[PDB]
């Protein structure tokens, strides 16, 4: 509610105590924060924040500014800059503190932090952070709240279980959170003056020596700064190398993009650390016996095992048929690409790859098929497709699907072969694969039945419905069956929704209502004409 | 990862100097925080949390206990206590602080506070709590980042508008969570002494009366 408006001093001191540890493990309220924190621009801003019972967001940030300096001697100088914002946004190269007012107006007599929550911004990967931390902060908490409050006991409000289901849907739906950000390389996050000195000593083309650095080559502080920069670079490259997109919550296109991205990233970083600056830095830090930095650079590469994992280029041998399928618009070309990609999948046999990941790629290919063939059939215009051409394209797509099912069976055989390989380590043996295209194929093959029955009905209309070939019943029946055919022809088409299939089923049962009316008519005309004898027109 | 592990003392003292600034709005560490320091189970749990990278979540719950009273007409007092939670639970009348490692790897040289994400919660109503916090935490921030980072111009992931709609329906369903106060029936407190006397005099098979309490019926303090 609306209460007394809190003062600047109490919350200012609270946040001043909160920032330094949470920002750089100390600092004790740095004066740079208080410079623009006490500024009238921030002062009236936070006054409006407290007083107005409508705003509940604010963003205080302290940016470690990468101040580019043009003076000869170094490249960049570390800087401190406090930022004040009322809207939350991703601060670049900084972590912010977001505050939400639990009460629309906050006061000092009641605990401010009781009526206001603290949120701290992530800069490394804000989306991954927010998603995973929200999951781990509300997903068990909300379940515990439901269990203790007995929401399952009171069935009058069955909507909290629905929001539990939807938050679960969120947490299992977006896992990538926009992975594959395509960060191939970064700059050199090491000591700047050594780099500039080496640049000046190499632009002359005279092989920058040990002595040209002066006393810095053996200065303990200089070597410590070199070690800190090397550690920062090794940590950044470790972070980018350990990036491995989760199989699920993506697509085969995402997989191939991630594969190419990691390949080019490792190619470029296996040629970047060999630059003369890095070599001379390592040589001159080791000159003062900085063995820890050397062993850190030797052991924390973290890419040699990734390079061995990526030695297999059969992934590309499957990616090429994947691009072929992406460009494929005809069924024959589609299952030609399927045969090719299965043949290449039999060639990943000799190489090494995570088996669960490869299986997930198999389902990814399966429902990517589902999608592209859905697009193809939408192109084919099954909305009002003629009967005979519908059957022809149906036979084509169904033999293509039978080829895909044979590929499915041969992939199961390859899975048995993998199990024969998996005897060497004997890990988990759980398997569950089912593409969603089967339901679409079910809808097609149930269109097949009414198409066949319609074709059977067309000739027999003229045959039996004609009187000995009554006329009024004949005319009524032909009108009804023709209009019913038109209605069931235009009611559903290339539509994929299974609820559309149920509507088609309703149309079919109405169609069969007319069909059974015709049956009653023709059977009545039958029996009244019977009883004569067995021969020919009689029976 | 486990290469360098922050010591128990440093992180424990950081929490000791951090908790009162939030759960008391700039106060000093109470006896509950002293018990938290001396709680061996809490010590082992925080050590496991800092060491094991399998779970990056830890929850400290400053519990409030229904302390028994013997005052002259004043109801039961509230006693501040502490609870340690490796996972997170639905706290009741018990303020909690959630600390989850923003940096999955653990390093003593790396700032532990800057290696951790700080969350907290107060016990008034979980519905509006979650709804308002998720709204004013993700919607402006996520919208600003997707608009300003060029992701809206990037066709690599149509995932973003879909999860925007998912967030919108999240907020809708969570704001709709305002139906029930959820207070059908609560236990009836009078006094432990009378209740246990009645139970012990009834389990033998006799009807409790005024005589069983004896002197307790005319004691002003007990009354």
Curated annotation (Swiss-Prot), chain B:
Location relative to the cell: Cytoplasm, Cytoskeleton
Coiled-coil residue spans: 162-183
Domain of life, per lineage: Eukaryota
Biological role stated in the UniProt entry: Cytoplasmic dynein 1 acts as a motor for the intracellular retrograde motility of vesicles and organelles along microtubules. Dynein has ATPase activity; the force-producing power stroke is thought to occur on release of ADP. Plays a role in mitotic spindle assembly and metaphase plate congression.
Family classification: Belongs to the dynein heavy chain family.
Note on domains (UniProt): Dynein heavy chains probably consist of an N-terminal stem (which binds cargo and interacts with other dynein components), and the head or motor domain. The motor contains six tandemly-linked AAA domains in the head, which form a ring. A stalk-like structure (formed by two of the coiled coil domains) protrudes between AAA 4 and AAA 5 and terminates in a microtubule-binding site. A seventh domain may also contribute to this ring; it is not clear whether the N-terminus or the C-terminus forms this extra domain.
Identification of the protein by name: Cytoplasmic dynein 1 heavy chain 1
Organism: Homo sapiens (Human)
């Amino acid at each position: 509610a609306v209460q007394n408006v809190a003062d600047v001093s109490v919350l200012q001191k609270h946040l001043r105590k909160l920032v330094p540890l949470l920002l750089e493990d100390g600092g004790e309220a740095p004066a740079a924060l208080e410079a623009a924190l006490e500024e009238k621009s921030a002062l009236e801003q936070m006054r409006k924040f407290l007083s107005d019972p409508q705003v509940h967001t604010v963003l205080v940030e302290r940016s470690t500014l990468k101040e580019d300096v043009g003076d000869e001697g170094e490249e960049e100088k570390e800087f401190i800059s406090y930022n004040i914002n009322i809207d939350i946004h991703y601060g670049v190269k900084s972590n912010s503190l977001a505050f939400i007012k639990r009460t629309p107006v906050i006061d000092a007599d009641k605990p401010v932090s009781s009526q206001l929550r603290v949120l701290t911004l992530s800069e490394d990967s804000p989306y991954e952070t927010l998603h995973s931390f929200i999951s781990n902060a509300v997903a068990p908490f909300f379940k515990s709240y439901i269990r203790e409050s007995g929401k399952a006991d009171r069935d009058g409000d069955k909507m909290a279980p629905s929001v539990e289901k939807k938050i679960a849907e969120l947490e299992m739906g977006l896992l990538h959170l926009q992975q594959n950000i395509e960060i191939p390389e970064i700059s050199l996050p090491i000591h700047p003056m050594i780099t500039n000195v080496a640049k000046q000593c190499y632009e002359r083309g005279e092989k920058p020596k040990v002595t040209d650095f002066g006393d810095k080559v053996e200065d303990p502080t200089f070597l410590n700064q070199l070690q800190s920069g090397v550690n920062r670079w090794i940590r950044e490259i470790q972070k980018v190398t350990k990036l491995d997109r989760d199989p699920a919550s993506g697509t085969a296109l995402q997989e191939i993009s991630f594969w190419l991205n990691l390949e080019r990233a490792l190619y470029r970083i296996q040629e970047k650390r060999e630059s003369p600056e890095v070599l001379l830095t390592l040589d001159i830090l080791k000159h003062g016996k900085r063995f820890h930095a050397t062993v850190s650079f030797d052991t924390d590469t973290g890419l040699k095992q990734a390079l061995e994992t990526v030695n297999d280029y059969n992934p590309l041998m499957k990616d090429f048929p994947l691009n072929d399928l992406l460009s494929a618009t005809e069924l024959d070309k589609i299952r030609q690409a399927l045969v090719a990609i299965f043949t290449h999948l039999r060639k990943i046999r000799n190489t090494k790859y995570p088996i669960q990941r490869a299986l997930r790629l198999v389902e990814a290919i399966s429902r990517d098929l589902s999608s592209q063939l859905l697009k193809v059939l939408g192109t084919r215009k099954l909305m009002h497709v003629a009967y005979e051409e519908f059957e022809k394209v149906m036979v084509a797509c169904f033999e293509v699907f039978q080829t895909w099912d044979d590929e499915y069976e041969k992939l199961q055989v390859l899975l048995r072969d993998i199990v024969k390989r998996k005897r060497e380590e004997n890990l988990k043996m759980v398997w569950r694969i089912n593409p969603a295209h089967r339901k679409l194929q079910a809808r097609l093959d149930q269109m097949r039945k009414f198409r066949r029955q319609h074709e059977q009905l067309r000739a027999v209309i003229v045959r039996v419905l004609r009187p000995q070939v009554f006329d009024a019943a004949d005319a009524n029946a032909i009108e009804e069956v023709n209009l019913a055919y038109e209605n069931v022809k235009e009611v559903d088409g290339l539509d994929v929704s299974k609820e559309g299939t149920e509507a088609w089923e309703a149309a079919m049962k109405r169609y069969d209502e007319r069909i059974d009316r015709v049956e009653t008519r023709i059977t009545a005309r039958l029996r009244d004409q019977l009883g004569t004898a067995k021969n020919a027109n009689e029976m």
